[PDB]
């Protein structure tokens, strides 16, 4: 069973480093049947935008662990809030980075 | 010795008050947190 793992990142270079990291950790650990597909989601500036992006393409990817980074503008730190919401609504933990 | 890791403006205001007054001499030492040291409270920072 493929596991799509979703990583919330800001520049494209973070997406390519994330996906090569996943490739290296698939070549590191078990790859016979546990093979992870890295998927990368950019930063939209709205928490309901985040909710909608993690719901329209990740929760049907069947994500096992989201990945979250600090909000661009440190005036209100509410970016990881909806994603912790959606993880925890069945109590899946978040990987705060 | 004082200690607080909070918002920067409070930092800054404490630093200004200690500067206008006599609390930067040899004896008034304290520790500071992470982000209060980058910005306006780094301009108002003491020497040491």
């Amino acid at each position, epitope marked *: 069973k493929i596991v799509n793992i979703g990583a919330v990142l800001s520049t494209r270079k973070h997406e390519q480093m994330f996906r090569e990291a996943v490739n290296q950790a698939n070549k590191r650990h078990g790859s016979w049947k546990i093979q992870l597909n890295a998927t990368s989601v950019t930063h939209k500036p709205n928490a309901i935008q985040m909710a909608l992006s993690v719901c329209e393409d990740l929760i049907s990817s069947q994500v096992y662990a989201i990945l979250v980074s600090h909000p*661009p503008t440190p005036n209100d730190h509410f970016t990881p809030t909806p994603v912790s919401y959606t993880a925890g609504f069945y109590r899946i933990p978040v990987l705060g980075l | 010795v004082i200690i607080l890791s909070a918002s920067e403006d409070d930092a800054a205001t404490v630093y200004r008050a200690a500067a206008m007054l006599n609390m930067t001499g040899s004896g008034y030492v304290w520790l500071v947190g992470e982000r209060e040291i980058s*910005g306006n409270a*780094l301009r108002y920072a003491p020497d040491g």
Partner: antibody
Amino acid sequence: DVQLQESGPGLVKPSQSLSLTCTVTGYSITSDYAWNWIRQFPGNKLEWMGYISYSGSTGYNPSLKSRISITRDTSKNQFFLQLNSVTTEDTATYYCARLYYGFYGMDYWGQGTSVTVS
Amino acid sequence: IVLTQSPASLAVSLGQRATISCKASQSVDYDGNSYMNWYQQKPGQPPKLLIYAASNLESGIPARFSGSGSGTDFTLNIHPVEEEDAATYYCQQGNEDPPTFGGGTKLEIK
């Protein structure tokens, strides 16, 4: 190695918003550092307008409290400067210089570029 | 306030003193530590910070450009004077809004 890249219209029109653009290469705009915009005169007179911090703080001259703005984008590591309510007298050299946020280090200035108004 | 510099048409030989002072509007120096940086620029390259805090030299320059200052008057001195001493000197303050800059002092080695 971190360096800065200039860009702009090069010839602004009367009552037209000056749109400058500066790129950072080798680091990030949100992590650290602050960026000032300076208009150098031919008589060796640097005239700083305003600066943007990595936390989203726009500190500029009080005379420009309603006709200046600095925006940025982190996905492409870029930042724009918008100067409104401009007049004919703007012939100078633009510099998107970099000063460590908190008035700490003046390391990387850039190259800037001359500009006239006509 | 336009900061004043002095002198502007001096003539310093090789070996003697090259004192260059400048006056601001109010007391830039506060709590002992100065806040009057000294920038040396060569025409053709962007300016650079040469002396920070008006009493400390950054890592990368030998101990030639020294100086001090307080209140309004801040002084930069060169010991010894070399061929690269001839440049454009700007003393600059960055305390609060608006951080106005200094004028321009032209120094020529004889």
